[PDB]
Design a protein around this ligand. Sequence first.
Ligand SMILES: *[C@@H]1O[C@H](CO)[C@@H](O[C@@H]2O[C@H](CO)[C@@H](O)[C@H](O)[C@H]2NC(C)=O)[C@H](O)[C@H]1NC(C)=O
Ligand code: NAG
Ligand code: NAG
Lengths: 129, 128
Amino acid sequence: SNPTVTGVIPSEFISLSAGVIEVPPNKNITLYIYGESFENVTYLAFATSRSEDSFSCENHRATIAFIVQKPTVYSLETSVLLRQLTPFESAFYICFKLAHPFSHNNQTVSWIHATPTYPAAIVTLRTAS
Amino acid sequence: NPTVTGVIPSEFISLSAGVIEVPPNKNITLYIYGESFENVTYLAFATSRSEDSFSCENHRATIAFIVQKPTVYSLETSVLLRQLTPFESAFYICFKLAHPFSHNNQTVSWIHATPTYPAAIVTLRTAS
Ligand SMILES: *[C@@H]1O[C@H](CO)[C@@H](O[C@@H]2O[C@H](CO)[C@@H](O)[C@H](O)[C@H]2NC(C)=O)[C@H](O)[C@H]1NC(C)=O
Ligand SMILES: *[C@@H]1O[C@H](CO)[C@@H](O)[C@H](O)[C@H]1NC(C)=O
Ligand SMILES: *[C@@H]1O[C@H](CO)[C@@H](O)[C@H](O)[C@H]1NC(C)=O
C-alpha cells in the first residue's frame, strides 16, 4: 500500500559510491524507477536531507514536482533536472506524492519518502556540490 | 516467451549504451523485471548474441543461477560474473524454461531473453 523502490536507472550517470548515483546537474535526464505499489503515485520529488526516521516528505521536499509516467505496474518513467546540491545538502532522496492524502499527526500529508525494497537498494542520487 | 524490461544490479560501476558494468567475480544480486516469466526456472548469460537468436542452448557461457519470483513481473537472483575474455563483448541474459521445446531437431530449454523495447537497459559486462 506504500510505494517501494528496488532500483533507479538514470539515463546518464557519472559514478557510484555508497548507494548514491551521481548524475549531471542542470541537465534533463530520464529516471527509470522499478518497484512495487506505484499505483497511487502521481508525482516524484526529491528531498535534500533524509532521516531514517522519515515517512512524510512534506517539509523536506526541496525540488519542484516531476510528473511520472507509468509504462507498467512495476515501473515509473520521469524526466528530471537536478540542481547542484548546496554545501548543506547531502543527497537527493526520492519522494512520492500520493493521489490520496493521509493523516499523520492530524496534518494531512501527500508526500512520502520512497521505501527501498531491500535495505541496500540504490535509490539515492547526488550532483556536484 | 519471456521479456526483460529492466535490470537492477545491487552493485555496479558504470553505464554506457544500454550496458551496465558490474564488479567481476563478486556476489551481486540481480532484480530482473519483465513479462512472461512464468515458465522461467534459471538464469544464465551468453557472451555472444545474434539478433536472430532464439535458442541460447549452445550460447550459454555461465553456470545457471536459480531465480526467485518475488512477483509475477520480477525475478530475483544472486549471480557471480567472471571477467569477460577479449573475445566476448558482454553478458546477455538467457532463461531456462520449464518444459523443453524442439528447434532444429534439438531439445532446447534455454532461450535468449528479448528486450521489451529496443532501447532497454538489459545487458551486463565486466572488465575484460
Ligand atoms: C490506491 O488508492 C486506493 C484508495 O484507497 C486503494 O484502495 C483501497 O485498498 C484497500 C485495501 O486494498 C481497501 O480496503 C479499500 O477499500 C480501497 N479503497 C478504494 C477507494 O478503492 C488502493 O489500494 C491504492 N493502490 C495501492 C497500490 O495501494
Ligand atoms: C555467491 O552467491 C551464492 C549464493 O548465495 C553463494 O553460494 C556463494 O558462496 C557466493 N560466492 C561468494 C564468493 O561468496
Ligand atoms: C508455462 O507452461 C505451461 C505449460 O506449457 C503453459 O501453458 C504456460 O503458457 C507457460 N507460461 C508462459 C508464460 O508461457
